[PDB]
Amino acid sequence: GSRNPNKLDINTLTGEERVPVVNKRNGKKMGGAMAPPMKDLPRWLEENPEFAVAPDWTDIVKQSGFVPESMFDRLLTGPVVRGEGAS
C-alpha cells in the first residue's frame, strides 16, 4: 500500500512531477496525488516539517534542481515506515 517511483519516468521532474512524501512520525505516505510538486517541494517541505521525501525521491529530488541541497537532509536516506496491509 504505497506509491514508489519504481515505475515513474523520472524525466517528468520539470517541476510538474508529484514527489511523494512520508511522515517521519506516523509514516503517512502520499504518492503524487496529495504529495508536493517538484517545483514547490521546498515550499511544501518547509510547510511540512514532520514530513520528508521518499528514498528513491531523495536521489530524484536531489537532482530535481528545485530543492536546495541543504534540504536534502529531509529527502530521507532509504528506509521508511508504511504498512496498512502486511501483518
For residue 59, report the phi and psi dihedrals to the nearest 5 degrees: -75, -50
Please say whether the beta carbons of 53 and 21 come within 8 A: yes
Q: How many residues does the chain have?
A: 87
CA gap 46, 49 in Å, rounded: 6
> What are the CA-CA distances from residue 33 to residues 71, 86, 87 (Å)?
22, 23, 26
Residue 23 pairs with which residues in a beta bridge?
Answer: 51
Method by which the coordinates were obtained: NMR
Number of other residues whose CB lies within 10 A of the CB of residue 40: 14
Question: Which three three-digit cell numbers place residue 44?
Answer: 511544501
Question: Which three three-digit cell numbers place residue 62?
Answer: 536531489
